[PDB]
Amino acid sequence: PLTLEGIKDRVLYVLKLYDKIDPEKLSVNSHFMKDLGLDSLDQVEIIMAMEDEFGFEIPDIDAEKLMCPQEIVDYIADKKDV
Amino acid sequence: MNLMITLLTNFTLATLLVTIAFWLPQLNVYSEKTSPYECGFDPMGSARLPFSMKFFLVAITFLLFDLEIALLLPLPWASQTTNLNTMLTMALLLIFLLAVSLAYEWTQKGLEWTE
Amino acid sequence: VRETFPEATIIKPADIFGREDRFLNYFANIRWFGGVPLISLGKKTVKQPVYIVDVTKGIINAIKDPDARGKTFAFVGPNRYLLFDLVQYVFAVAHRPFLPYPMPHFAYRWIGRLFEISPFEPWTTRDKVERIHTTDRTLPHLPGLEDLGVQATPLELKAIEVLRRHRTYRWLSSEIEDVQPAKTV
Amino acid sequence: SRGEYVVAKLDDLINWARRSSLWPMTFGLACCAVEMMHMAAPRYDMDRFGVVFRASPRQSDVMIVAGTLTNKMAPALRKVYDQMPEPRYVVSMGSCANGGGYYHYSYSVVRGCDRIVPVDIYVPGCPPTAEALLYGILQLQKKIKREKRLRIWYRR
Amino acid sequence: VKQDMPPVGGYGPIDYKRNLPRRGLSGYSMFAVGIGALLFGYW
Amino acid sequence: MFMINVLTLIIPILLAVAFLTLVERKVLGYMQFRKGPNVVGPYGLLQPIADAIKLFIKEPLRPATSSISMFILAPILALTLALTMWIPLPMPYPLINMNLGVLFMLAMSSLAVYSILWSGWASNSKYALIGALRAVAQTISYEVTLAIILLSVLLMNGSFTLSTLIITQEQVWLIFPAWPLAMMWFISTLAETNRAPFDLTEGESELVSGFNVEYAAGPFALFFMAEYANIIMMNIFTTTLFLGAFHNPYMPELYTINFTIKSLLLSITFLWIRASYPRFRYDQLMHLLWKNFLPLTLALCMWHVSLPILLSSIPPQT
Amino acid sequence: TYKYVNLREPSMDMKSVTDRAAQTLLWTELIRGLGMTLSYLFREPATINYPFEKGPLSPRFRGEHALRRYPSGEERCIACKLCEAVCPAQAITIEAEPRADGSRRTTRYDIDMTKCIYCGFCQEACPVDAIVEGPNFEFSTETHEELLYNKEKLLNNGDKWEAEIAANIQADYLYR
Amino acid sequence: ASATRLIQGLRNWASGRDLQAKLQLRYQEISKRTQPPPKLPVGPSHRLSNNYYCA
Amino acid sequence: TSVKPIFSRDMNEAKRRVRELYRAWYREVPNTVHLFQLDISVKQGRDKVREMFKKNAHVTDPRVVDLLVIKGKMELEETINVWKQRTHVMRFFHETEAPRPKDFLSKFYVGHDP
Ligand SMILES: CCCCCCCCCCCCCCCCCC(=O)OC[C@H](COP(=O)([O-])OCC[N+](C)(C)C)OC(=O)CCCCCCCCCCCCCCCCC
Ligand SMILES: CCCCCCCCCCCCCCCCCC(=O)OC[C@H](COP(=O)(O)OCCN)OC(=O)CCCCCCCCCCCCCCCCC
Ligand SMILES: CCCCCCCCCCCCCCCCCC(=O)OC[C@H](COP(=O)(O)OCCN)OC(=O)CCCCCCCCCCCCCCCCC
Ligand SMILES: CCCCCCCCCCCCCCCCCC(=O)OC[C@H](COP(=O)(O)OCCN)OC(=O)CCCCCCCCCCCCCCCCC
Ligand code: SF4
Ligand code: SF4
Ligand code: SF4
After folding, report:
1. F270: which residues sit within 8 A by CB, 6+ positions away?
2. Which of G28, G31, G34 to mutate to test the interface with E (most CBs of E within 10 A)?
3. Cα dihedral angle (C170, C173, C174, C175), rounded to 10 degrees?
4. Does any CB of chain C come closer than 8 Å to the CB of residue F123?
5. What are phi and psi of D123, to 5 degrees?
C-alpha cells in the first residue's frame, strides 16, 4: 500500500513460497499457463494465496484475467491507492 | 471438635470410596472410549459454547429474594421481644414488600422467560 | 530357531511404536511421576523406531515371497534419533511439561525393586531400563524393509495418531503443523 | 493350592457380580426393539434377573443390537460400543444384526453386526420372541459364569 | 361344517365407553375438612 | 468413643441406601404390574450386593476432554454432603445436637447443588451442560420456598433446634396446623432431590442421563448412593418436621421404631409418586415454585407470623 | 358418525367453580392417579417364572427348521427346490444328484439361519412336508457359523423333534 | 382371583371400580389348548359342473 | 440438441462455478483437518482434493459439470456442518485397501480380470 515496489516484492515472495513455481523461471512478465506450465487450479490457489497475504476478497471475473505477475501487482494497485 | 471429627470421617470415607474404584478395576484405555458423548456421533463444536440462559431475570431475582430469607429468618427469635406490635408491623411489612416485588415481576412479564 | 528349522524366516524389528505399544506409551506415561528420568540426560543412546504397519506388511511380504525363505530380516525405520531428542519429540507432540534429570547407575536399577513391589502388570523394570538405554545397532548387511517392497513410514507422520490420547483438553484442537520435527542423526 | 482356591472364589464372586446385574443399554433399531421391550414387559420381565436399562453407554454392560445395521449407523454403533467400559458384552438380536437378515443383499445394509463389533451371543429369529431373547440373556449369564479371569491371571 | 364360528345366541354385548365413577367429596366438604383440621391444630 | 458413634451412624445409612435400591426396583415393579428382582437372593435380598460389587470393579472411564480435578472432586462432595446431613437429625438424640441445626440442614442443601453442578460442568459434554443448567433452573425455584416453608413451620416451634421439634409436637402433630405448608414442603422436597415428577437433571428422555451421563461405574455410584441417601434423609427430615412421634425419655426405642416406620412410609410414598406421574417440563417447575407455590407461601408466612401473636401462643425460644 | 373429543364447555356456576378450585388446590386427580397405582400394588403380577415356566404358544409356531422322515426311516426330501424358490431371503441352498439306489435326493441342503426370516413359506411350499419349522426357539449360539445349518444339522433336528412336530402337524394339517 | 377379601376390597376401593368381574389375568374361562378336528368348508367353485374357468 | 440448462449457459460460467467450488474446498481443508482431528496434513488433503477434481477432467458437457458442482456443494455442506464423521472424510483416502495390480503381469498372476 505504500510503494508499488514493495507490493511487487511481496507478490514475488508469495509466488516463490508456492512449491511448483520455479524461482528461476519466475519473473515479472512470466505467463503462468503457457510458460510455467500450470493448470487453472494452481493459478487459483496462487490468487487465494494473494488473498491470504494482502487481505481482501478477490472476485472471479477479475481473477480470471490474472495470467502474469504484472497484471497481479497492477490489479492490487487498482484495489489500493498507491 | 466432634463436628470436625464427623466432617473429616465423612470426607475420608467419601474419598476412600473413590480411590478404591480406580486402582481396583482393569484400565484398558484407548482414544475412542474417552471421546465426548453426543449420542453415538461426533460432537458439533465444543461443549464450552455459551448455553444462553433464557431464565436470566429470574436468576437475578432469586438473589434479591434470597436476601429476603436472610432478613425474614430471625422471626422465630423476634417473636420473643417485649415490643411486639412493632415487630408484627415490620414482619408483615417485609412480606408485603416481597409480595409487591413478586407482583411487579409478575405483571411486567419477568417470571416468564425471554424468547 | 535358526539351527533347528533351517528355513525359519527370522525378522528383526528394531523398536516398534504404535497404539497399544510400550515404546511411545512408555515415554508418554512418565509425566506425573516426577520428571522423566534418564542417564546423562539420555543423549548417549541412539534409536530408530519402526512403525507397526511397516512391520506387519513386512510379515505379509515375508509370507508371500519364496525368496524370503531362511533369511534374517532387520526391519528398521528410515530415521535414526538420539534418545534425548526422541523424548523431546514425545513430550512436544503431547504438549507436556518436561524437566529431565540424570539418575545414575547408583540407584536407577534399584528403582525396579522399588517400583515393581506390586505383583501386577509392571510399569517399569530393570530390563526396561537396560533396553531403553541400549542403542540400536546398525546391521547394513542384513536385508531390511527396502528388500521386501515396503516403504518405511517415519515417526512424524504417525506420532500424532499415537499420542493424541495423552493431551488433556487445552490442545486437543491442535495440528501436526504445529510441532517442529525432531533432529535426526 | 491355597491361593488357587482364593483366586477361584474371587473369580466366582466377581463373575457372579457381573452376571447377576447385567445392565443393558437402551439400544433398539427395528422390529426387534418392540420384542426387546416385550422382554422388559411384565410377562417375561428382564428386571427380575437384575437386568435394568441404563440409557448411557458409560454405565451399561451388554448392548443388545436389536434391529438392522445399515451403512449410515455403522460408525455410530462402533462409537457407542467403544464408549462402553470393559467388561462389555454384545447380544446380536434378530437375523439382520446376525447375518444380514431379510435385507442381506441390499446396497445399504451391513451384513451382520459382527463386522462392526465383537459379538458374544447370537440370538436368532425374525424377531426372536421375548422368551428367546431372555434365553439368550440367560445363556450370556452362563457364559459369564464360566469365565476364569483371576485364575488365568494367577496361572499366567 | 366344523369351523371357528360365533355361538348360537351370538356373543354378549361389549362395553366400549368411558366409566369414571365420580368419587370423592364436594369442594365445600373438602375445604370444611381442611379448615377444621386447621382449627383443631391451632387450638 | 465418638468415632464408633459416627461409624454406627453412617454405615447403616450406607446399607439402607443399597437396600433402598432393591425396595425401589421392587415397589416400582409391583406398582407397574410386574415383579422386581427376586432371582439373585431370596426374594431380592442380594441384588444390592450385586449392584455394590459390580460397579466398583468396572472400568472408571475418565474422559479425555473433561477437566479432571473438578470431575473427581464432584462425587466426593456429593457423598460427603449426603453423609453430613444426618448428624443433627434427632433419633431421638442426634449425633451432633446443634443449636441451629435447621440452618445446617438448609445450608448443606444449598451446598449439595455444587456436586451436580461441577459434575455437569467438568464432564465435558453437552448433555452434562444441559443437566447442570437445568439444576440451576431447579435450584433457583426450590430454594425460594425451601426457606420460607421451613421458616413458617418453625414459628410454632420458636427455635431452629431439631431436638426441640419433638417437644413442640408432644400433644398434636404439626401437620394439623400447617397442612398447606406440609403439602407444599413435600413438593419442595420432591423438586429438591431430583425425584420424579421433577427429575430434570437426570432427565432420561430429554437428555440421556443429564449431568452424570459421563460418569461410568465407580464415580457414578457416589451420585447413586448420594441421591438415595439424600431422599432417605429427606423423608426423615419431613417426618421430624411434621409427624414427630411420642418420646419417652426412658424408652427411646418407641420413638425410634415410630419415626423409622413413618420414614419408611414416606420413602414408599416417594417411590409411589415416581411410579405414577409424568415428568414436568422444567419451565413448568419454574412457573410452579414462583407463580403458584410462592404467593401462597408468602400468605401462609404472614399467617404464621401473625397467628401466635393473635392467639397468645408464642412458643418459647428455650 | 363422528364425535368431538375435548369439546366440553365447563359449567360456570359457583358450585362447580368451587369444585374445580378444590381440585386445583387440594389435588383430586393426583390422589386418583395414586389410588389407581396403589390398586395395582395389591394384585398378582403377570411375571411368569422363566426358565421353570414357559410362555404360552400354539401348535402353529414357527421356530427352528428340520427335515422330517416317513415312518419307515426314509428322508422325505426329494430334492425339488420349491423351498429355495419361494424363500424370500434365499437362505436355502440345494445341490442334488442321484444316490446309490437312484432316488432323487439332496447332497447339500443349507438353511442360513441368519438370512432366514422364519416366515414359513418353505413349510407350506414343500409338497411332501419334508422341511418344517418346528417348535424350538431356544437355539441361540455363541458363534455365527453355528447358525449356518447344513443338511446334517437339519436331519438331526428332525430326529430330535420328530416326536413333537408329528403331533403338531397331526393337530394342524386339516387347516392347511 | 386368589386375593383375600380385605385386599380385594381395598383394591376395589383404590381403583374405584369393580375388578373381579373383569380380570386381565386369564383362568379356566379360555378355550382348551387341545381342539377338536376341524372340517373347513370349500369354496363356491368346488363344483363338478359349470366349472369353465373363462366364465 | 436444444435442451434446458441447469445453471450454466456454456462452458465459461461452468468453469467459473467449478473454480469457485475449488476455492471453497481450498478454504475448507484446514478446517476439516482441524475440527475432525484427523491425522492427515493440509498438503495431503489439498492434493487429494486436486485428485478428486482432476478425476472428472474429461467432461465437456455443461450440464454434467453443473451437476458435479452441485454434488460438490453437497459434499461441502456435509463437511462444514458436521454431518460426515471422521470415517466419512477418510473414505476418500482408501488406506485399508490393499494396493491393487496395475500392469498386465500381476493381473495375470492374481485372477481373471481384464
Ligand atoms: C408432608 C407429607 C405428605 C403430605 C401428603 C401429600 C399427599 C399428596 C402428594 C401429591 C404429590 C404430587 C406431585 C407433584 C404435583 C405437581 C402438580 C401440582 O399439583 O401443582 C400444584 C398446583 C398447581 O396448579 P395448576 O398448575 O393446576 O394451576 C394452573 C395455574 N395457571 C392458570 C397460572 C397456569 O396447585 C397449587 O399450586 C396449589 C398448592 C396447594 C394449595 C393448598 C391450599 C390450602 C388451603 C388454603 C386456604 C384456602 C381457603 C380460602 C382462605 C381461607 C382462610 C381461612
Ligand atoms: C479365606 C476364605 C475366603 C476367600 C475369599 C472369599 C471372598 C468372598 C467370597 C464370596 C462368595 C464367592 C462365591 C460366589 C458364588 C459361587 C457359587 C455359585 O456359582 O453360586 C451361584 C448361586 C446362584 O446360582 P445362579 O446360577 O446365579 O442362579 C440362577 C437361578 N437358579 O449364588 C448364590 O446362591 C448366591 C451367591 C452369593 C455370594 C456371596 C454373597 C456376596 C458376597 C459377600 C462378601 C463380599 C462383599 C464385600 C462388601 C460388599 C458390600 C456389602
Ligand atoms: C442385621 C442383618 C443385616 C443383613 C443384611 C443382608 C440381608 C441379606 C443376607 C443374605 C440372605 C441369604 C442369602 C443366601 C445366598 C445363597 C446361599 C447359598 O446357598 O449359596 C450357594 C453357593 C454355592 O454353594 P454350593 O456348594 O454349590 O451348594 C450346593 C449345596 N449342595 O454358595 C455360595 O455362594 C457361597 C456362600 C455364600 C454365603 C453368603 C451369605 C450371605 C452374605 C450376605 C452379607 C451379610 C452377612 C451377614 C450380616 C449379618 C450378620 C453379621
Ligand atoms: C479442594 C476443595 C476443598 C476440599 C476439602 C473439603 C472439606 C469438607 C467440605 C464439607 C464440609 C463443609 C463445612 C462448612 C461449615 C459447617 C459449619 C457447621 O457445621 O456449623 C453448624 C454448627 C452450628 O451449631 P451451633 O449453634 O454452633 O451449636 C453448637 C453449640 N453446642 O456448628 C457447630 O456446632 C460448631 C462445631 C465446631 C465447628 C468447627 C469449625 C467448622 C468446620 C470448618 C471446616 C472447614 C470447612 C471447609 C469447607 C470446604 C468446602 C469445599
Ligand atoms: S431380524 Fe427381522 S423382524 Fe428382526 S428387527 Fe430385523 S427385520 Fe425386524
Ligand atoms: S422360513 Fe422363510 S426365510 Fe426361512 S428358510 Fe423358510 S422360506 Fe426361507
Ligand atoms: S425340503 Fe421339500 S420343497 Fe425343499 S427340495 Fe426337499 S422335498 Fe422339495
Report:
1. F190, F195, F231, F235
2. G28
3. 160
4. no
5. -105, 105
Tell me if E3 and H39 make a contact (CB, 8 A cut-off).
Answer: yes
H36 touches chain E (CB under 8 A): yes
Method of elucidation: cryo-EM
Number of domains in chain B: 1
For CA atoms G166, G168, G170, G175, give the dihedral sign. Answer: negative
Question: DSSP assignment of chain D, as one string?
Answer: -HHHHHHHHHHHHHHHHHHHS--BB--B-SHHHHHHHHHHSTTT-GGGGT---BSSGGG-SEEEEES--BSTTHHHHHHHHHTSPSS-EEEEEHHHHHH-GGGTT-TTB-S-TTTTS--SEEE-SSSPPHHHHHHHHHHHHHHHHT--HHHHHHT-
Chain G residues inside the 8 Å CB shell of D95: 89, 113-118
Place of cell 432366514: G116
CA G37 to chain centroid: 33
Mutation pick from B13, B16, B90 vs chain F, by most beta carbons of F within 10 Å, is B13
Distance CA F175, CA F266 (A): 14
Please name the residue whose Cα sits nearest to atom 26 of ligand 4.
F99
Residue C95 zone, left/alpha/beta (φ > 0; ψ -120 to 50; rest):
left
Nearest residue in E to H18, CA atom: E21
Within 10 A of C99 (CB to CB), how many other CB atoms are there?
8
Distance (Å, whole) CA C91 – CA F82 = 41
| Grid cell for residue B21 | 474404584
Q: Amino acid letter at F229?
A: A
G77 alpha carbon, closest ligand = 7
Give me ligand 1 centre to Cα E19, in Å. 26
* One-letter amino acid of D67: G
Q: Which residue(s) pair with D123 in the sheet? A: D93
Residue ranges covered by each domain of chain I: 1-114
Q: Render the burial of G66-102: b for 16+ CB within 10 Å, e for the rest.
A: bbbbeeeeebbbebbebbbeebebebbebebeeeeee
With left for phi above 0 and alpha for psi between -120 and 50, is residue G74 left, alpha or beta? Answer: beta
Pick the ligand that lies closest to the CA of residue D146.
2
DSSP string over chain B: -HHHHHHHHHHHHHHTTTTTTTSSS-----TTTTS--BTTB--SS-TTS----S-HHHHHHHHHHHSHHHHSTTHHHHTT-S-HHHHHHHHHHHHHHHHHHHHHHHHTT-SSPP-
For residue D126, the ligand closest to its alpha carbon is 5
Resolution limit, Å? 3.8
Beta-bridge partner residues of G69: G75
G148-149 and G104-112 strand pairing: antiparallel
Catalytic positions of A are 39
Count of C-beta atoms within a 10 Å radius of residue D86 = 14
| Mutate-to-test residue for ligand 7 from G83, G87, G108, highest number of ligand atoms within 8 A of CB | G83
DSSP string, G88-128: TT--EEEEEEE-TT--EEEEEEEEETTT-----SHHHH-TT
| Alpha-carbon gap, residue F177 to F159, rounded angstroms | 17
Candidates E1, E21, E23; nearest CB to H41: E1
Question: F163: helix, coil or strand?
Answer: coil
d(Cα F308, Cα F157) in Å, to the nearest integer?
Answer: 10
Q: Do I53 and A44 touch (CB under 8 A)?
A: no
Residue recorded with cell 383443631 = E40
Residue A11 CB neighbour total at 10 angstroms:
21
Q: Do chains B and C touch (3 or more CB pairs under 8 A)?
A: yes
How far, in Å, from the CA of G128 to the mean position of ligand 6?
16
Q: Is F280 left (phi over 0), alpha (psi -120 to 50) or beta?
A: beta
The rounded distance, in Å, linking the Cα atoms of C52 and C21 is 9
**Domain that residue B112 falls in:** 1-115
